[PDB]
Design an enzyme around this catalytic site. Structure first.
Site, short mmCIF file in Angstrom:
data_model
loop_
_atom_site.label_atom_id
_atom_site.label_comp_id
_atom_site.label_asym_id
_atom_site.label_seq_id
_atom_site.Cartn_x
_atom_site.Cartn_y
_atom_site.Cartn_z
N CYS A 19 0.82 -1.36 0.47
CA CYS A 19 -0.26 -0.76 0.26
C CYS A 19 1.13 1.50 -0.17
O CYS A 19 1.90 1.42 -0.46
CB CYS A 19 -0.82 -0.16 1.50
SG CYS A 19 0.16 0.06 3.13
N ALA A 43 3.18 1.44 3.07
CA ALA A 43 4.13 1.13 2.98
C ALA A 43 5.45 1.97 2.41
O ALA A 43 6.38 1.73 2.18
CB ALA A 43 4.18 -0.84 2.87
N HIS A 71 5.75 6.88 -2.43
CA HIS A 71 6.86 7.24 -3.18
C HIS A 71 6.62 9.05 -3.50
O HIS A 71 6.82 9.89 -2.64
CB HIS A 71 7.70 6.22 -4.17
CG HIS A 71 8.34 5.06 -3.98
ND1 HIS A 71 8.21 4.23 -4.45
CD2 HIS A 71 8.07 4.32 -2.85
CE1 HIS A 71 8.19 2.98 -4.52
NE2 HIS A 71 8.27 3.11 -3.22
N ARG A 99 11.91 -3.87 7.29
CA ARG A 99 13.30 -4.04 6.25
C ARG A 99 14.16 -3.53 7.06
O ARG A 99 14.86 -2.74 7.82
CB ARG A 99 12.46 -2.80 5.46
CG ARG A 99 13.21 -2.29 4.20
CD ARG A 99 12.61 -1.34 3.63
NE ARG A 99 12.94 -0.46 1.84
CZ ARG A 99 13.04 0.91 1.90
NH1 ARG A 99 13.27 1.19 3.40
NH2 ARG A 99 12.81 0.81 0.05
S1 ICS Z 1 12.73 1.68 -3.02
FE1 ICS Z 1 11.29 0.22 -3.52
S2 ICS Z 1 10.13 -3.45 -3.29
FE2 ICS Z 1 13.32 1.23 -5.21
S3 ICS Z 1 8.84 -0.10 -2.89
FE3 ICS Z 1 10.26 -1.77 -2.80
S4 ICS Z 1 14.43 -1.01 -1.19
FE4 ICS Z 1 11.76 -2.66 -3.49
S5 ICS Z 1 12.08 -3.16 -6.06
MO1 ICS Z 1 10.92 -4.30 -1.35
S6 ICS Z 1 11.50 0.68 -6.00
FE5 ICS Z 1 13.53 -0.60 -3.13
C1 ICS Z 1 12.24 -1.38 -3.18
FE6 ICS Z 1 12.53 -1.01 -5.22
S7 ICS Z 1 11.16 -2.27 -0.81
FE7 ICS Z 1 12.96 -2.13 -1.25
S8 ICS Z 1 12.99 -4.04 -2.43
S9 ICS Z 1 14.47 -0.28 -5.10
#
Ligand code: ICS
Ligand code: ICS
Ligand code: CA
Ligand code: CA
Lengths: 522, 479, 522, 478
Positions: free
Chosen positions: D60, D63, D193, D94
């Site tokens: 979401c 997140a 974002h 995370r």
């Molecule tokens: S931010 Fe994004 S999902 Fe660019 S929401 Fe997500 S720490 Fe992924 S593919 Mo979880 S855009 Fe980073 C991402 Fe890629 S959380 Fe991490 S891995 S590079």
């Protein structure tokens, strides 16, 4: 001094300044102690390659063995039979020690008697001790059977157990049909595992040797199981559980599990459960006989094959994934019973745990010691997990066994930096874990002093001990655990991966220093 | 409790199970106390052979020597000479505490052995022992002496450890002490004590006879026969040096060979464990003119009595430091009594221990208002029983070298609140729902000696005797 | 840099000097960080009584909660039903989180769907999401049943789940008799445990509410067992095993044990095991219904009592000695089955462990937290062991519960320094373990940062965490354990006494300093 | 592998299970690559709503804001405003690594929440939020800012977190950032974002606009969009500073509010994760004139390419130091290839990740001689798919917002050697006997960025793909 609401035992009482000062006085005044720089210098030296080479050149001196003596095994073996008193023909000090030994491991009562041979008997024999002893013990503790072994005194002076027991019967000290199986169990031959084999072979012989005429292989439709020297309750229970799960008729020959786990309900039960006499007498009629710990049941195998005519299968101890599979398929083949869905599922669950946990296990380096079957099982499982057994020590191991282990290591990419040591002790092992440091040790409680030694060199040198084997004296209730089958494999995996994760948490617990890697999720 | 007639019938009944030979013997080792009787020999015999097959609790002469007297001596290496068992079963079993760097300058918890195999049995182990000594010397260079603790087969195969010892002793300029403590000799751990004391006398104690460099004082003493179980000897010493004395040696808990060699320089030998070290004490008096006295550091009553008896051997400066030490610890032990005595008052204790404690602990129990309704020793002699009968109440039970069967049957009848004995008894009584304390190893607790040990002893007795676990042994659907 | 044969991950790679230097650069140049002396001063202050008093005066802010939200609980409940898809009506982000949450604790797949309501539906309702959602989910994953719960968005906008589901049937999106029970599960009411209770009552209602006419209490001769929110596999397994051991007919209502432990055999099994629909339909015919976790099964209790007319017995959670005794005696009473010899022995065995281990347990001080039933059971067992539960925290506890626990503590001399806190969090707990330090914490993984905090003040201030509860993310396979019955009592005792003994070994491991008390035997 | 006709038939077959409405949508989100196609909108659509009930892997907007962008910022306290769930499920989930004294000057792993109850939903949480601010101030005095991360119901009940923030912002002289990242907004983490980049711009970024006291240099850069999973940003930074650059800020792994405030002073923005931070980068170019470029620190090939592109933006002195950096690490990564490439050569990987990695990791797989046979994103826009189609081979599979059922069916047919995705997929494919590496959390390993990361990446791909466990799934009696 003591504060009555916060009373201190030895730790931490003796850290108080006043005891510190007094202990300093004692040392300086009277102990004539080597200077601490000299103790420091000698310490660093015991950790070196130079010292290790001198260490490995020992021929006469043993330091910190990793075995006990034969009669210890004979006692354990004897405790697995219904209403049976272990009876060790020789010196009483042995029996005090056997009892206390097992007492500390099992935290249970261990009943065993001596016939208290003294210097008198060291010269005219202990025949009188055996007549009066057998008579006394039958009258006082009312076993249905007395299972006789020997201490090194009786061995050295040459007491004839067979004649001594037969004369005890002929002069009327015990009744003619009162079962008194025996086995010479010299402490200067082999080890505790050898005494277990010798005792078991003695009892099988007592009950079957002269009655083979009426026996027919396979007429009772059961498979005999000989467990060998076994000191985890879960091992006996897992093997019984799996075989009943497959619908397989079985006889576990030497089954101590009840008498080593009686309830605290107001009563002391000197005897509980145990393999019956009728089971031992009927054993030759089994389909076959399976030996869980074949590397110290060689005498037993020769008798089973030679006299009972069973085709004993060539099975490893059922430890880890492949060997438990092999055991079960062999039981299935002998019995005609299929492996049920319930055991297929348990297997799959074990596999699933391997898959979830492989990334922390991979490449982790172990030192480990123990009895030969246990050690090879543990080596096999470590390899299945992608771990590297580096230092593999069996003090009571032999050359044939070592060859078998070396071939196991050679079948795997994870065995490449592994060396197997037979005849060596925990002072040898202590050198190896300094000179070629592993991540952990897998061993028994004695191993705590190695870990203590490593920590003294520096935190970075410490090699933590993961307690698996015999004896375990400094933790409670681990003797209730399981090492065999999918079950014991699950328990080992869990202890291994969590020992690694605990140690990582410890290394990353430093605020603003290492706690960047202190993850909630692993 | 029970009448004299009742206990006497308890004895007779328990003994009806035995064959006649064992019955007639056993009868002699079970007594109903009469605390007037000063000659123990009237009521009970001791220090005889165990009956075969009766599950004695006794150990052996090796245990008495290596396990008890020699083992603790921290800066010597002590060799278990024989097969692998005995050294392994005793290894680190006894909480004889010490300060050291184990494996470097101290060696107490380690198990050195010759690991006899069949070739050594058939052809003797003297050449093996000689090569063993050179191996010990290369690998443990900071050892200050070696002993050789003989296991059963050594004397039986005709090995000459004395000759090896003097030959290697000369070659290396080192004290090497051959001890003939083979387990078939004697009847218990007791003869091991004697043997061990005789080996100290002959190979060690004499070493400084001609050395006049030790600077002695009027207040020099030795603690003789305290093996520092959980720190007991420490918790004893601190009281003696607070009282103004100089404790030159400890035999043998936290003990060094130099401290043993300096013992002939003291003014007084303070003997705790009379059973084990009355031998050497008598020797030191004969040879060196050093007097000795028995003492008791179990509970405030006995400690206070001892502190005052010991001070009275010295001058008034020591006698009033005594009263200052006693005044200092008064509030501490009085608080322990106030806390715990109400929790233990009237509770009945049965004991079975080795050669001292079965009498020596009685005052400590009484200081918490407890009653020792029964006691006995595995290996005492009649001089121990003399000293016990006064310390026990009328009609109490006395047992020597009690069998497993007997002790069990005595408990069933007497129904004590608390049993104190050893590891091979504990798990038995726990299952019968009787609180048990280990009175050798102190259940991994202690110290129990002195004013600081008292507080621990009182805490321990209470933590076990009044533990919630003991109410839970009956399933509620069988009430 | 890396040496290719000894590759370093984040720990210990970033301890290298060149990373240390660079991290030092970044701080000085750009982070404008508070001085270290000031961080130290503020840290010391967070450890004090003064800070505690301010900490306990919070009314608005929550820091480090010890509860989750309703629909978590509803999902777990729904997973325990045969071929059932948990389906949460509302926003998709909730479900991603629910799954990941359970995935980390169980290390298994967690299947659950959302109908992905967006801002469109925040205004016109999510009736279309439910019609399409129910249809898509049935066609794609082929459940036999869809168990619906709600996220806080659907609750706030007032979606009428009942009418949406009925309109789904009416317009042909799913068949009329396809089973779709539901429950409203607002995250701003109670906690995860309240969600389980709402879901369960909803499923019970769906299957029985309109068919009560033909029911007769006790006509099936079974006892229903409702487990509550439960995340140890061994708890489900132990209850089943004990009951089968007593020969007692039973129905475990919500039984996720199979779907949370499928084998890794080449196949993915989205659905496995679980309470059947016929089981739920036939539940009113049971002799009675037993609620294993009654403090969060209040709504279920009202329904079972009011509609099924069962006389739900007044049992605590079957944890520790006394309460497992009570459970078994109640089952025996309702069922007519006697407690078998094997259960009496198991009980006796537990007592025996207590007797062997009492001297290390006695007086040990615990801080602890969890869900209400788990916590009271743990408090109760600690008291039985002779331990002192000092800081008892339940973030989702209520006033009636706290009274019940206070009465339990007053019935024991070991309760005297205990206080029970409801509505408080892990930041409140962190203050308590500084100002009134216990020996250990018993809690879930979040606790690991508390221990980290305590160790920062000093080694003498460190309070180690013993992991028992939910979630446990930083160790593997603990979720296979047992906390209920004599079994779970044995596992808890063994972990307690060994955590104490491990910590003692750590404290006495210092060569020539503390290793005088480093005993081989304990 | 498969012919285009086979993959295209695979798509058809898997989709037959759906109802017509979900079938027609799903069809547009699944494609067979054509690597000449520069305009991704010809082959596949993205960034649309999830079909209900299909078990999306998506998260979401909360997140994307709190979990992803703001969460990591270490010296601010970030408030999960709403009920207790969301902040509890993403507490410490995370691995955004940082250096600090948690609870004292840094706050990343903690969960701060308003824990809404019924009274707060019915009457609003604005007065609760204002009392919460004061309690944060008393109990955590060394915090340098606060954000308020709206959970779903905030916007739904009509609460005014903007006004609370200005009022309390002014009273206490503190930066308080209201963020409207409620989970019903948008369709995925993506809108979060955006929403979060807009909250940075409006409440934080402009703060030193009129401050000239920062001593700047020609070589000042910022790492935009590296959230330092396992240390990835640290393992990127060392290389840029070795090359002679001065890394002023990291957004937002190991990130501080002062480093965000100084970013307008830099000469160039180095953007790793385009999806999450192209918004603010575009802003800084419009407003401050600061240029930005995309880069890729995954594997030796991409990192070398990136160091040289970055260097060429500067003078001969940086371009020279570049070749010295490259020269220094050459033996290290060559030894990693020598050791690991022979173990992984020819192995096929399927990926499914969020918004960058599904393309950015492809070169590092190829550097170990591996083939990415399939890839896709939870929440990409078509600008991401543009950048992907070149990096993928002909006839490879492409999937957007893949359903659980889809991804499973696709693996059954493609049979990759290795799958890399997230936690909600891992355990599924392990039971199938397919090696699985977590490609968000790095499976508790990493860093994977740069030359030090590559060695770990390579070790990790091998440790799993060749692990002995994978040969044991079939009982020998079957
Ligand atoms: S931010 Fe994004 S999902 Fe660019 S929401 Fe997500 S720490 Fe992924 S593919 Mo979880 S855009 Fe980073 C991402 Fe890629 S959380 Fe991490 S891995 S590079
Ligand atoms: S020595 Fe003796 S048995 Fe005087 S052999 Fe034994 S450490 Fe006992 S009753 Mo174990 S004469 Fe010491 C003894 Fe008493 S071992 Fe300890 S406790 S006071
Ligand atoms: Ca026991
Ligand atoms: Ca799993």
């Amino acid at each position: 001094s003591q504060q009555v609401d916060k009373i201190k035992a030895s730790y931490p009482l003796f850290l108080d300044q006043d005891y510190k000062d007094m202990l300093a006085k004692k040392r300086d005044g009277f102990e004539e102690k080597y200077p601490q720089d000299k103790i420091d210098e000698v310490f660093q030296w015991t950790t070196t390659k130079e010292y290790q080479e001198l260490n490995f050149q020992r021929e006469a001196l043993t330091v910190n063995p990793a075995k006990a003596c034969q009669p210890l095994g004979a006692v354990l073996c004897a405790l697995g039979f219904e209403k049976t008193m272990p009876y060790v023909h020789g010196s009483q000090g042995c029996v005090a020690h056997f009892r206390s030994y097992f007492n500390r491991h099992f935290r249970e009562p261990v009943s065993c008697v001596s016939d208290s041979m003294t210097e008198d008997a060291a010269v005219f024999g202990g025949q009188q001790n055996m007549k009066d002893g057998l008579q006394n013990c039958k009258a006082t503790y009312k076993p249905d059977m007395i299972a006789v072994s020997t201490t090194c005194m009786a061995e050295v002076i040459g007491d004839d157990l067979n004649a001594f027991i037969n004369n005890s019967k002929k002069e009327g000290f015990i009744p003619d049909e009162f079962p008194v199986p025996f086995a010479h169990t010299p402490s200067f031959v082999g080890s505790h595992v050898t005494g277990w084999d010798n005792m078991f072979e003695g009892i099988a012989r007592y009950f079957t040797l002269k009655s083979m005429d009426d026996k027919v292989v396979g007429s009772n439709k059961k498979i005999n199981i000989v467990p060998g020297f076994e000191t985890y309750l879960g091992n006996f229970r897992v093997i019984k559980r799996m075989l009943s799960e497959m619908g397989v008729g079985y006889s576990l020959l030497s089954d101590p599990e009840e008498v080593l786990d009686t309830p605290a309900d107001g009563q002391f039960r000197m005897y509980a459960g145990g393999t019956t006499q009728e089971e031992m007498k009927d054993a030759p009629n089994a389909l076959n006989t399976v030996l869980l710990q074949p590397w110290h049941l060689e005498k037993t195998k020769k008798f089973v094959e030679g006299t009972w005519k069973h085709e004993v299968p060539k099975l490893n101890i059922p430890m880890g994934l492949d060997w438990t599979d092999e055991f079960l398929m062999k039981v299935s083949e002998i019995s005609g019973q299929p492996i049920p869905a319930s055991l297929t599922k348990e297997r799959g669950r074990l596999v699933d745990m391997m898959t979830d946990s492989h990334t922390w296990l991979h490449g982790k380096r172990f030192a480990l010691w123990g009895d030969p079957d246990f050690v090879m099982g543990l080596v096999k499982f470590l390899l299945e997990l992608g771990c590297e057994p580096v230092h593999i020590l069996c003090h009571n191991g032999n050359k044939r066994w070592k060859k078998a282990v070396d071939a196991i290591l050679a079948a795997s990419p994870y065995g490449k930096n592994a060396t197997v040591y037979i005849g060596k002790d925990l002072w040898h092992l202590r050198s190896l874990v300094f000179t070629d440091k592993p991540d952990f040790m897998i061993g028994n409680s004695y191993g705590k002093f190695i870990q203590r030694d490593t920590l003294h060199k520096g935190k970075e040198f410490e090699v933590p001990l993961i307690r698996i084997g015999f004896p375990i004296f400094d933790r409670h209730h681990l003797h209730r655990s399981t090492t065999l089958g999918y079950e014991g494999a699950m328990q080992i995996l869990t202890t291994l991966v969590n020992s690694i994760l605990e140690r990582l948490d410890e290394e990353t617990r430093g605020m603003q220093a290492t706690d960047y890697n202190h993850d909630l999720v692993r | 409790g029970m009448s004299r007639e009742e206990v006497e019938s308890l004895i007779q009944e328990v003994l009806e199970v035995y064959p006649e030979k064992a019955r007639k013997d056993r009868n002699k080792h079970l007594a109903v106390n009469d605390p007037a009787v000063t000659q123990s020999k009237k009521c009970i015999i001791s220090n005889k052979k165990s009956q075969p097959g009766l599950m004695t609790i006794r150990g052996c002469a090796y245990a008495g020597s290596k396990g008890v007297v020699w083992g603790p001596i921290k800066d010597m290496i002590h060799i278990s000479h024989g097969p692998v068992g005995c050294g392994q079963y005793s290894r680190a079993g006894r909480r004889n505490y010490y300060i050291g760097t184990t494996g470097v300058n101290a060696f107490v918890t380690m198990n050195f052995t010759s690991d006899f195999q069949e070739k050594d049995i058939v052809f003797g182990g003297d050449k093996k022992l000689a090569k063993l000594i050179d191996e010990v010397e290369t690998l443990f260079p900071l050892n200050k002496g070696i002993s050789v603790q003989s296991e059963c087969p050594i004397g039986l195969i005709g090995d000459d450890i004395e000759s090896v010892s003097k030959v290697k002793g000369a070659e290396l300029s080192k004290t090497i002490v051959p001890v003939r403590c083979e387990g078939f000799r004697g009847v218990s751990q007791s003869l091991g004590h004697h043997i061990a004391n005789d080996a100290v006398r002959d190979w060690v104690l004499g070493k400084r006879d001609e050395d006049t460099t030790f600077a002695s004082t009027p207040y020099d003493v030795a603690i003789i026969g305290d093996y520092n179980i959980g720190g007991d000897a420490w918790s004893s010493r601190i009281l003696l040096e607070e009282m103004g004395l100089r404790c030159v040696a400890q035999w043998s808990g936290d003990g060094s060979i130099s401290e043993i060699e300096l013992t002939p320089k003291v003014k007084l030998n303070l003997v705790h464990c009379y059973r084990s070290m009355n031998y050497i004490s008598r020797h030191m008096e004969e040879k060196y003119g050093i007097p000795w006295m028995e003492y008791n550091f179990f509970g405030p009553t006995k400690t206070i009595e001892s502190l005052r008896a010991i001070a009275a051997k010295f001058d008034e400066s020591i006698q009033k430091k005594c009263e200052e030490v006693i005044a200092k610890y008064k509030p501490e032990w009085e608080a322990v009594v106030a806390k715990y005595r109400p929790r233990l008052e009237g509770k009945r204790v049965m004991l079975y221990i080795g050669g001292l404690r079965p009498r020596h602990v009685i005052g400590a129990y009484e200081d918490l208002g407890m009653e020792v309704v029964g006691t006995g020793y595995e290996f005492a002699h009649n001089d121990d029983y003399d000293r016990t009968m006064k310390e026990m109440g009328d009609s109490t039970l006395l047992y020597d070298d009690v069998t497993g069967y007997e002790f069990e049957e005595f408990v069933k009848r007497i129904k004590p609140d608390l049993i104190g004995s050893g590891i091979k008894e504990k798990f038995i009584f726990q299952k019968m729902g009787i609180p048990f304390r280990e009175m050798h190893s102190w259940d991994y607790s202690g110290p129990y000696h002195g004013f600081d040990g008292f507080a621990i002893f009182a805490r321990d007795m209470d933590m076990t005797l009044n533990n919630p676990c003991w109410k839970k042994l009956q399933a509620p659907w069988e009430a």
